[PDB]
Amino acid sequence: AYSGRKIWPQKHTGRARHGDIGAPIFVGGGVVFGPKPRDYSYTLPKKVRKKGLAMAVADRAREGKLLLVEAFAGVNGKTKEFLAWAKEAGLDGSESVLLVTGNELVRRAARNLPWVVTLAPEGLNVYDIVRTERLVMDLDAWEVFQNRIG
Amino acid sequence: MEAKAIARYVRISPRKVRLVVDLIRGKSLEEARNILRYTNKRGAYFVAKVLESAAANAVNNHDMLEDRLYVKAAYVDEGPALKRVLPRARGRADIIKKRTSHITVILGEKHG
Amino acid sequence: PRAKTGVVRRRKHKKILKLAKGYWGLRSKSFRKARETLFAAGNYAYAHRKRRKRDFRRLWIVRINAACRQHGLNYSTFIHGLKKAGIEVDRKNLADLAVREPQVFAELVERAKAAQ
Amino acid sequence: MFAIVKTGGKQYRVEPGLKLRVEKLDAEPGATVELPVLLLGGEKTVVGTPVVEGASVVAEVLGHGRGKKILVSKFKAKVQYRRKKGHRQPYTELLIKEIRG
Amino acid sequence: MKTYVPKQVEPRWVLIDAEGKTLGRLATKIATLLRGKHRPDWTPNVAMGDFVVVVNADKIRVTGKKLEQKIYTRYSGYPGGLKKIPLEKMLATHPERVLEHAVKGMLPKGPLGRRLFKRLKVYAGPDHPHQAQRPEKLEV
Amino acid sequence: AKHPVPKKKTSKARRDARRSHHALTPPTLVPCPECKAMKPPHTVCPECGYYAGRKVLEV
RNA sequence: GGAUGACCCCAGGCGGUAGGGGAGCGUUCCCGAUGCCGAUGAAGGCCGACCCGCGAGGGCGGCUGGAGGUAAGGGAAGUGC
RNA sequence: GUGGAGCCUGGGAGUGAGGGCGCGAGCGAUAACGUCCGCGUCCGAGCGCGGGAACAACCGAGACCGCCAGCUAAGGCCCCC
RNA sequence: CGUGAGGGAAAGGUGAAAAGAACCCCGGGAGGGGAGUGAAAUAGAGCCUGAAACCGUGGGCUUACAAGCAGUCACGGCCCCGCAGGGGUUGUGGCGUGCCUAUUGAAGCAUGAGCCGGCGACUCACGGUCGUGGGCGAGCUUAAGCCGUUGAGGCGGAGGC
Ligand SMILES: [Mg+2]
Ligand SMILES: [Mg+2]
Ligand SMILES: [Mg+2]
Ligand SMILES: [Mg+2]
Ligand SMILES: [Mg+2]
Ligand SMILES: [Mg+2]
Ligand SMILES: [Mg+2]
Ligand SMILES: [Mg+2]
Ligand SMILES: [Mg+2]
Ligand SMILES: [Mg+2]
Ligand SMILES: [Mg+2]
Ligand SMILES: [Mg+2]
Ligand SMILES: [Mg+2]
Ligand SMILES: [Mg+2]
Ligand SMILES: [Mg+2]
Ligand SMILES: [Mg+2]
Ligand SMILES: [Mg+2]
Ligand SMILES: [Mg+2]
Ligand SMILES: [Mg+2]
Ligand SMILES: [Mg+2]
Ligand SMILES: [Mg+2]
Ligand SMILES: [Mg+2]
Ligand SMILES: [Mg+2]
Ligand SMILES: [Mg+2]
Ligand SMILES: [Mg+2]
Ligand SMILES: [Mg+2]
Ligand SMILES: [Mg+2]
Ligand SMILES: [Mg+2]
Ligand SMILES: [Mg+2]
Ligand SMILES: [Mg+2]
Ligand SMILES: [Mg+2]
Ligand SMILES: [Mg+2]
Ligand SMILES: [Mg+2]
Ligand SMILES: [Mg+2]
Ligand SMILES: [Mg+2]
Ligand SMILES: [Mg+2]
Ligand SMILES: [Mg+2]
Ligand SMILES: [Mg+2]
Ligand SMILES: [Mg+2]
Ligand SMILES: [Mg+2]
Ligand SMILES: [Mg+2]
Ligand SMILES: [Mg+2]
Ligand SMILES: [Mg+2]
Ligand SMILES: [Mg+2]
Ligand SMILES: [Mg+2]
Ligand SMILES: [Mg+2]
Ligand SMILES: [Mg+2]
Ligand SMILES: [Mg+2]
Ligand SMILES: [Mg+2]
Ligand SMILES: [Mg+2]
Ligand SMILES: [Mg+2]
Ligand SMILES: [Mg+2]
Ligand SMILES: [Mg+2]
Ligand SMILES: [Mg+2]
Ligand SMILES: [Mg+2]
Ligand SMILES: [Mg+2]
Ligand SMILES: [Mg+2]
Ligand SMILES: [Mg+2]
Ligand SMILES: [Mg+2]
Ligand SMILES: [Mg+2]
Ligand SMILES: [Mg+2]
Ligand SMILES: [Mg+2]
Ligand SMILES: [Mg+2]
Ligand SMILES: [Mg+2]
Ligand SMILES: [Mg+2]
Ligand SMILES: [Mg+2]
Ligand SMILES: [Mg+2]
Ligand SMILES: [Mg+2]
Ligand SMILES: [Mg+2]
Ligand SMILES: [Mg+2]
Ligand SMILES: [Mg+2]
Ligand SMILES: [Mg+2]
Ligand SMILES: [Mg+2]
Ligand SMILES: [Mg+2]
Ligand SMILES: [Mg+2]
Ligand SMILES: [Mg+2]
Ligand SMILES: [Mg+2]
Ligand SMILES: [Mg+2]
Ligand SMILES: [Mg+2]
Ligand SMILES: [Mg+2]
Ligand SMILES: [Mg+2]
Ligand SMILES: [Mg+2]
Ligand SMILES: [Mg+2]
Ligand SMILES: [Mg+2]
Ligand SMILES: [Mg+2]
Ligand SMILES: [Mg+2]
Ligand SMILES: [Mg+2]
Ligand SMILES: [Mg+2]
Ligand SMILES: [Mg+2]
Ligand SMILES: [Mg+2]
Ligand SMILES: [Mg+2]
Ligand SMILES: [Mg+2]
Ligand SMILES: [Mg+2]
Ligand SMILES: [Mg+2]
Ligand SMILES: [Mg+2]
Ligand SMILES: [Mg+2]
Ligand SMILES: [Mg+2]
Ligand SMILES: [Mg+2]
Ligand SMILES: [Mg+2]
Ligand SMILES: [Mg+2]
Ligand SMILES: [Mg+2]
Ligand SMILES: [Mg+2]
Ligand SMILES: [Mg+2]
Ligand SMILES: [Mg+2]
Ligand SMILES: [Mg+2]
Ligand SMILES: [Zn+2]
């Protein structure tokens, strides 16, 4: 916001040479190599993202902590239902769950829980897989995921 | 016991007024009374106030009797300073600091 | 994000200054005057350890000599006796002996006297 | 009754009952060693030429440790050059049991 | 095992006659009795030598044309203030000086080598008023 | 003249070593022989008013 | 040696400015975190002759402070006077 | 002749003011702490260390750390020492 | 501040709550001492924390025949902590030419720095050329955009080597 103006004459003042108070070496003035707004995004090869999604699940299975399910019994979009379904399912949420299905009903009861990360199936991603402890996928979720690695 | 009075933010220079205090730091109450009365400094008045007043407190607020009193310690720390602008030739302004003092007189009783 | 100075500086300064208590004037009070005095101290140390070896030697040898005087020979022969004979007592020790074991020293003088 | 022993290029005089920590010796704590004699004195008086050939002194390794940090530091001027090195010398504190001889 | 440093000692007085004695060669000796370098428990940092008493200093001998051809010197700080006394004139006015000087310049400098020169009590003339210390006559 | 000026800042040592004399020195008082108050001698007593033992200053 | 830098034995090299290569310490921020420490005291400040590290440092203890701080492992820089 | 030798290909440099000394020459005056080449060396960068009274380059000698141990180098061994 | 166009500052925080200190005593007052509130008043309004330079009071060592880049090494004294160990200070001795910069060369009588604190200088984007960790391989790869999610990724073969 400052004026482009030399603040006292070059020689003979007795003080050190200065330009204007816009300069970084003055309190006030612009900072040197400042952060300027930018774009950290990049285009990771398509194959590498696939093998990512392959490997991630592939690891979770290989550990036993995967689980494909056909449909969700007593659960029509109402937490305590799911909550109790999950009980009969083999997860009491002492481990975190990544949970995938296109079914707003299911993943809605299944939202709000600490140990649950909700997902739709076209939105399967490798951070989220590794992020969690236990993957409980689902069958069309499974075919979208299978339609992927091809 | 020990009795204390303290005058702070007093518009005299520390360095000038320490010299009244070093003339008491030690003396009886009565000696400090008669010194700060014929001492020819400005500091005389200022310090003879604190003193006089700590010897209240000792009596009134602290159950002490005068003629056991003596100036046990008495120091002067330096208060923040009124900065002022005094103009010189060719337009320079220099800065006067009209300095400032925190006087302290601390009393005790002397058994003897 | 701004990684501002904040605390680092105060902490090395507080450091070097504490390394420098005891010093005269601002050599103990100013950071950069302490820092500067401490560069000094450093090499005066490293030198003076290497110095103190040779320093003591000189001390001992001067005593040793003073002893061999008392029995009629110089340091520089007494240490050729001791040599060519076979005695390998170093002079921290000779200096020790000669001070607090006069007779025990006298022996060696003699065997040196001899070994010539 | 005393001796003078070479142990790690360095000769100490040693009466029995002395604490004398010296240049770190390879000896699990508790064991005991023998140090050559170079001279014995008081009571008797032998003289090693260079060794006494005969006797020796026996002592117990009270244990090891590291010496109070010397702070070695070089500085060269007008050349932008410093160096801090920390130093703790390994030592082996002993207990002079008795002399032989 | 740590070096032996002496505890407090005793002031051992010592008496020397100069006469027929080559000034320099004498002072060598005076200085090292003075310091103490002749006794095993010597220590550079402490006053522990002897208490040299020299007498008959006036009958010291010097070689060569030196009685004249060698000169003492004394700046005074003023201009032209360099005094110059020659050996002969020195011996003839204060001979006790000639030897003192001879020694002081073989003692170290600083508060010790000064504190040492304090001890060398010199006289031209045979008798010396230091009887109450019984100076142990020495052969130089 | 060419404006002479201090060449180095004076240390606290010298600074205070100079003031080694600024030592203030207490007044000198004596007993009025009449009011027995302390006062400086040869003055007329400020407290009773007497001097050479007569009324002088109507306090 | 042994067995895939675990650690031991041996021999050797190790002054260094311009400058090149390496391995590390710390500051701010992010994932780790719906977590974990914390008024039985966070960060900050003031001591320490103790502990670890060659070192930059990091621990530990006491006083102060009075509501924050944030690990293993990684990431990003307005990163050290 | 296995050496912080060499050769090959790439990455990053800095340097392109040098100074003293010995020797061989030009210039100058069979002057210069002078100038300019050549061959060496040392300082530069070894203003670290012993000698030379002191003192970049002269002699001794190439400082990883510690030692209240030993032999030596130059140079010293009458006191300072 | 400048006639003017114009330049252009500094300066945030008590506490949970004002419960913001009645009344008393020295004081002309300022201020302080009791008392009273508060968890806390060295949170008392000049108010969180409260560094450093800088000024002072009190205490331990030391200092008036001594020569100094202020240190270092060694020994001794006195003082404290302790029970063959430490810490503090400094009497004597030995050694010893500040930092930075610029230079063939500086303690240098060559530069800069009163001191403290706090700001203060190798970056970002696109493009090259090497190296490097990974993916695919006679192949590799998407751009803008379309769809999806609002901290979910997919699509798109135009085009590029
Ligand atoms: Mg503008
Ligand atoms: Mg503007
Ligand atoms: Mg502008
Ligand atoms: Mg303009
Ligand atoms: Mg100017
Ligand atoms: Mg100026
Ligand atoms: Mg410009
Ligand atoms: Mg500003
Ligand atoms: Mg700004
Ligand atoms: Mg990038
Ligand atoms: Mg949730
Ligand atoms: Mg949520
Ligand atoms: Mg979770
Ligand atoms: Mg009263
Ligand atoms: Mg005017
Ligand atoms: Mg001013
Ligand atoms: Mg921030
Ligand atoms: Mg910064
Ligand atoms: Mg301090
Ligand atoms: Mg000191
Ligand atoms: Mg040395
Ligand atoms: Mg040697
Ligand atoms: Mg030998
Ligand atoms: Mg050892
Ligand atoms: Mg050191
Ligand atoms: Mg230098
Ligand atoms: Mg240089
Ligand atoms: Mg440097
Ligand atoms: Mg190192
Ligand atoms: Mg003659
Ligand atoms: Mg005029
Ligand atoms: Mg002072
Ligand atoms: Mg090695
Ligand atoms: Mg080497
Ligand atoms: Mg190197
Ligand atoms: Mg922070
Ligand atoms: Mg979180
Ligand atoms: Mg949190
Ligand atoms: Mg808890
Ligand atoms: Mg509480
Ligand atoms: Mg606490
Ligand atoms: Mg704290
Ligand atoms: Mg909070
Ligand atoms: Mg954290
Ligand atoms: Mg990290
Ligand atoms: Mg910056
Ligand atoms: Mg090489
Ligand atoms: Mg090479
Ligand atoms: Mg080559
Ligand atoms: Mg590079
Ligand atoms: Mg050229
Ligand atoms: Mg040229
Ligand atoms: Mg040339
Ligand atoms: Mg050359
Ligand atoms: Mg050359
Ligand atoms: Mg030339
Ligand atoms: Mg020439
Ligand atoms: Mg020539
Ligand atoms: Mg160098
Ligand atoms: Mg070289
Ligand atoms: Mg040299
Ligand atoms: Mg020099
Ligand atoms: Mg030299
Ligand atoms: Mg020399
Ligand atoms: Mg030898
Ligand atoms: Mg020789
Ligand atoms: Mg105006
Ligand atoms: Mg106006
Ligand atoms: Mg409010
Ligand atoms: Mg009025
Ligand atoms: Mg009031
Ligand atoms: Mg009061
Ligand atoms: Mg009040
Ligand atoms: Mg507080
Ligand atoms: Mg507070
Ligand atoms: Mg304030
Ligand atoms: Mg607060
Ligand atoms: Mg405050
Ligand atoms: Mg304050
Ligand atoms: Mg004091
Ligand atoms: Mg004294
Ligand atoms: Mg004198
Ligand atoms: Mg004295
Ligand atoms: Mg001198
Ligand atoms: Mg000491
Ligand atoms: Mg000294
Ligand atoms: Mg020495
Ligand atoms: Mg000096
Ligand atoms: Mg420097
Ligand atoms: Mg520096
Ligand atoms: Mg220049
Ligand atoms: Mg020049
Ligand atoms: Mg120049
Ligand atoms: Mg250069
Ligand atoms: Mg100067
Ligand atoms: Mg210049
Ligand atoms: Mg200068
Ligand atoms: Mg500069
Ligand atoms: Mg100024
Ligand atoms: Mg700063
Ligand atoms: Mg770069
Ligand atoms: Mg940018
Ligand atoms: Mg690149
Ligand atoms: Mg193939
Ligand atoms: Mg493709
Ligand atoms: Zn009267």
> What DSSP state is assigned to residue A40?
-
- Whether residue E27 contacts residue E104, with contact meaning beta carbons closer than 8 Å, is answered with no
Cα(A96)–Cα(A98) distance, rounded to whole angstroms? 7
Token pair belonging to D48: 């090693």
Identify whether the C-beta of residue B71 lies closer than 8 Å to the C-beta of residue B27: yes
Give which of D19, D28, D26, D23 is closest to D7, Cα–Cα.
D23
Q: Can you count the helices (H) and strands (E) in chain A? A: 5, 3
Residue D15 burial by Cβ neighbours in a 10 Å radius (0-12, 13-18, 19+): middle
CATH architecture of B2-110: Alpha-Beta Complex (3.90)
CA distance F59 to F57: 6
Is there a contact between B38 and F39 if contact means CB atoms under 8 Å apart? yes
Using an 8 Å Cβ cutoff, are B74 and B106 in contact? yes
Q: Which two tokens stand for residue B98?
A: 């009209």
- Could you tell me the two tokens for D99? 């002399």
What distance in Å separates the CA atoms of residue E139 and residue E32, rounded to the nearest whole number? 14
- All residues with CB under 5 Å from ion ligand 25: C 45; D 71
Report how far apart the first and last C-alpha atoms of chain F are (Å, whole number). 58
Q: What is the resolution of this structure in A?
A: 2.9
Secondary structure (3-state) at B61? coil
- What one-letter code names the amino acid at B9? Y
What angle do helix axes E23-35 and E95-104 make, rounded to 10 degrees? Answer: 60
CB atoms within 10 A of CB E64: 8
Q: Which residues contact B91 (CB under 8 A, 6 or more apart)?
A: none
User: In chain A, at which residue ranges do the beta strands (DSSP E only) sit?
Assistant: 97-100, 116-119, 134-136
Q: Rounded CA gap, F44 and F39, in Å?
A: 9
ω before D50 within 30° of 0 (cis)?
yes
In chain E, DSSP assigns E strands to 12-17, 50-55, 71-74, 83-86, 121-122, 136-137
Are the C-beta atoms of residues E28 and E35 closer than 8 Å to each other? Answer: no
Q: How far is CA C60 from CA C93, C101, D14, E40, in A?
A: 9, 15, 19, 9
List E residues 1-20 in contact with D (Cβ-Cβ < 8 A): 1
Q: Checking DSSP bridges between strand A134-136 and strand A97-100, what pairing results, if any?
A: parallel
Residue spans of the domains in chain B: they are 2-110
Q: Which residue reads 């030690």 in tokens?
A: B26
Tokens 């004979």 belong to which residue?
Answer: C85
Residues paired with residue B85 on neighbouring β-strands, in sequence order: B95
CA distance B65 to B111: 11
C-beta separation of A131 from A56 below 8 A: no
With residue C64 as reference, give the H or E element that holds it.
helix C31-69
Round to whole Å and give the CA distance between D62 and C44.
Answer: 35
A50 touches strand I (CB under 7 A): yes
- E35 forms beta bridges with none
Q: Which two tokens stand for residue B102?
A: 């925190």
Residue C92 is given by DSSP the state H
Residue closest to D61 by CA, chosen among D99, D87, D23, D89? D23
- Looking at this protein, which amino acid is placed at residue D74? K
Residues A40/A46/A52/A53 CA torsion (nearest 10 deg): 110
The structure tokens listed for E140 are 């130089």
Stated as kind and residue range, the H or E segment containing B80 is strand B76-87
Name which of A52, A67, A56 is nearest A134 in CA terms. Answer: A67
Q: Which of E33, E49, E53 is nearest to E41 (CA)?
A: E49
Closest-approach nucleotide to residue B6, Cα vs C1': I32
Question: Are F and B close enough to touch, i.e. 3+ CB pairs under 8 angstroms?
Answer: yes
Question: What gap in Å lies between CA D17 and CA D58, rounded to an integer?
Answer: 11
Q: CB neighbours (10 Å) of residue E34? A: 24
The answer for residues whose C-beta is within 8 angstroms of residue E45's C-beta and 6 or more apart is E112
| C1’ H59 / CA E46, Å | 37
Nucleotides of G under 7 A from a protein CB: 16-18, 26-29, 31-32, 34, 44-48, 50, 52-57, 76-81
- Inter-residue contact D14 to D5 (CB < 8 Å): yes
Cα of D77 vs centre of ligand 53, distance in Å, is 28
Taking an 8 Å cut-off on Cβ atoms, the answer to whether B41 and F39 are in contact is no
Three-state SS sequence of D30-56: CCEEEEECCEEEECEEEECCCCCCCCE
Give yes or no for a contact between E44 and C56, defined as CB atoms under 8 angstroms apart: no
Residue in this structure with the two tokens 């006659």, named with its chain if needed: E17
CA distance F20 to chain C (A): 19
Compute CA C105 distance to the chain's CA centroid, rounded to the nearest angstrom. 24
Q: Which residues contact D89 (CB under 8 A, 6 or more apart)?
A: D24, D66, D67, D70
Structure tokens at E48: 């522990």
